[PDB]
Amino acid sequence: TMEILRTENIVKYFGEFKALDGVSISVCKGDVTLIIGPNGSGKSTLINVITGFLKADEGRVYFENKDITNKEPAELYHYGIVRTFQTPQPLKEMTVLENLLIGEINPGESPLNSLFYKKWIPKEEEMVEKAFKILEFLKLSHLYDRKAGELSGGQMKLVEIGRALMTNPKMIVMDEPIAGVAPGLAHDIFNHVLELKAKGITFLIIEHRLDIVLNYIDHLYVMFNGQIIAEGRGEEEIKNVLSDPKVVEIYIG
């Protein structure tokens, strides 16, 4: 059942505003950990911290029982950490394949800082084969040469998860992939989520609320104002924890 990632009271500040007041989690192996909370509670901050993007003012982060606190995102790549980045504008001007090919130009690193080491896209024998394999898996076989701009929101998010796949991570980090989408697509993003969970990959997803994908969740952790206000790790634990009075109040609006 072992744990794979645990923080030790993560704190953060943005001027005078303490965006995180010692956040301690329990991400683990093969689990589909989802952190939800209204906007402002610091959900995308705990992430930039866990990924190294934003520094921990005071606290720790352990992966495989190791201190990775404050390590560079480019450092974490070799530990097993990777994050799903929204595809940039100059990036949406290149095909789906290449958009995953760059996922290796710089692994565990920003699509910006990855493609910025690209003089001419790496059409090496192994990278092509690996990509196209991943393009079939994600059911995005038929779009290998479609510009990424021509991709719907749905077709897009999976090419972004593929880009993050082009490293072969032990854990992937997603910040609101279904947040906003139609219910048909919610299951779609999450479909592959279980298609990769059964391949040995651990997820750290983050959504505003948890409505549609409750039957997937392996572990829930709610957040309000930089802290953890409730937690479930089972269907009834989570249902109760969502339909928990104070927990359904912060979502009245």
Ligand SMILES: Nc1ncnc2c1ncn2[C@@H]1O[C@H](COP(=O)(O)OP(=O)(O)O)[C@@H](O)[C@H]1O
């Ligand atoms: N660069 C920043 N400078 C100052 N405040 C920030 C910055 N980034 C985020 N915040 C603030 O931190 C709070 C919540 O953090 P945020 O990452 O936005 O969490 P969430 O994902 O729940 O919206 C908000 O008040 C937000 O505007």
Ligand code: MMC
């Ligand atoms: C121990 Hg999850």
Ligand SMILES: [Mg+2]
């Ligand atoms: Mg956020």
